[PDB]
């Protein structure tokens, strides 16, 4: 289905779809392929989960439901039609879909059609309403009555299937074919009208049963056992988890990249217990104001250093021209994209990736030179008034990029040389 990497890369229409959904994706994609000419497959190669998420979001569909039961008759009536529910009616009733498609594009209008439909007795029959000759219906819609009837016959023919004997009431009533007793009660048998004909409640009940069967066979779509069926689980062994416990052997390496004696510590301990029982003065704790002054110097130096650390506690406010700010952000963004793709190629590790690595290396070099030329532009645009800040802002991505270039050169010298 539409789930492989190849399928997701193939769906150019879906790619354009979420493209048109976003705006920064036009920005990024335009710079990536329109401006830089990157292979758009490798563009989308990162965004594969996003593509699949968009596809699966677009791909779901609802389940069937009794749309005619949700239809209410609502003096006068005003049509308040919902197109999704109109198509729901179409899908649930292909007869109604057919009656739409041979009349509205031929004879009259859609709201006129639906007014005729709500007027029609075919609507009442398809809904849970007993048909009545007092009702006149709509003649145009009610011409489809026998067509819907033979649809019902064909659908019932499709719905017929053999039954399991374990639950077969037909086999149950065919237990004794020579039962000769008495005629059962009118009360518990299906009653009829005065002239022997039925009222049709059996028809409406078999119709709603047909609706149920249609729903369950819609469930039963494309998208022996009695031994298991008759198991009595209540007298069986309880399930126990096979979860594995874990122990932990403990032997850690010592931290890598004079010794005191009991006599000496005991001597000092005796002496300091003597001093402890001897004396203790709070007033002697006051310092000499000179080594204390050096303490003041050290403390104040620490305060100054950490205060300058705290002095640099939406992005930050900047005094850049807004266009050059956007341009440099754009260049940073596409350089980051190039760098990520180059790392994807490099950490892949194949000889098939070699020309890709070389070409992305060329693109990184081009981005470097374009960064330098941008630096020349902000040079002769500022006289290095804040072109220094421009260079420093674009610095770290450039450092990482050129570090990657050095890594590529080093591995080239490692393998080839």
């Amino acid at each position: 289905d539409s789930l492989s990497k190849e399928k997701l890369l193939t769906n150019l229409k879906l790619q354009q779809s979420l493209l048109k959904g976003n705006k920064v994706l036009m920005k990024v994609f335009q710079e990536t392929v329109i401006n830089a000419g990157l292979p758009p497959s490798e563009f989308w190669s990162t965004r594969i989960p996003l593509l699949r998420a968009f596809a699966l979001s677009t791909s779901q569909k609802v389940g069937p439901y009794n749309v005619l039961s949700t239809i209410k008759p609502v003096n006068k009536v005003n049509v308040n039609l919902s197109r999704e529910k109109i198509l729901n009616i179409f899908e649930n009733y292909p007869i109604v879909k057919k009656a739409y498609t041979d009349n509205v594009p031929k004879n009259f209008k859609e709201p006129e059609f639906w007014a005729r439909f709500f007027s029609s007795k075919l609507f009442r029959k398809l809904r849970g309403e007993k048909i009545m000759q007092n009702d006149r219906g709509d003649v145009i819609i009610d011409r489809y009555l026998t067509l819907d009837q033979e649809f019902d016959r064909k659908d019932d023919d499709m719905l017929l299937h053999p039954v399991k004997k374990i639950i077969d009431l037909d086999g149950n009533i065919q237990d004794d074919p020579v039962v000769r007793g008495n005629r059962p009660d009118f009360t518990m048998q299906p009653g009829v009208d005065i002239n022997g004909n039925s009222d049709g409640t059996v028809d409406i009940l078999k119709g709603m049963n047909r609706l149920s069967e249609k729903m369950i066979m819609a469930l039963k779509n494309e998208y022996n056992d009695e031994r298991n069926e008759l198991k009595i689980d209540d007298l069986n062994e309880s399930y126990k988890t096979n979860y594995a416990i874990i122990h932990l052997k403990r032997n850690a390496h010592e931290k890598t990249t004079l010794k005191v004696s009991n006599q000496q510590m005991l001597q000092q301990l005796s002496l300091v217990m003597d001093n402890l029982i001897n004396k203790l003065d709070l007033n002697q704790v006051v310092p000499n104001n000179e080594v204390s002054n050096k303490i003041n110097k050290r403390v104040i130096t620490a305060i100054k250093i950490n205060a300058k650390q705290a002095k640099h506690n939406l992005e930050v406010k900047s005094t850049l021209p807004i266009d050059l700010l956007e341009s440099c952000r754009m260049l940073h963004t596409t350089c980051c994209e190039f760098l990520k793709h180059f790392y994807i190629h490099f950490q892949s590790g194949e000889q098939k990736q070699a020309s890709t690595v070389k070409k992305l290396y060329n693109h990184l070099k081009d981005c470097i030179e374009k960064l330098n030329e941008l630096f020349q532009d902000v040079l002769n645009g500022d006289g290095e008034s804040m072109s220094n800040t421009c260079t420093a802002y674009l610095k770290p991505v450039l450092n990482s990029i050129t570090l990657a270039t050095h890594k590529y050169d080093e591995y080239f010298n490692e393998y080839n040389n």
Binding site: L12, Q15, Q16, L19, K20, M26, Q30, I34, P40
Partner: peptide, 21 residues
């Protein structure tokens, strides 16, 4: 190949079309 080129050129038109919009 050649048949992939018109597809990208179709994407080229769509990218230009979304630009003015």
């Amino acid at each position: 190949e050649e048949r992939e080129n018109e597809k990208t050129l179709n994407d080229y038109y769509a990218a230009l079309a979304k630009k003015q919009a």
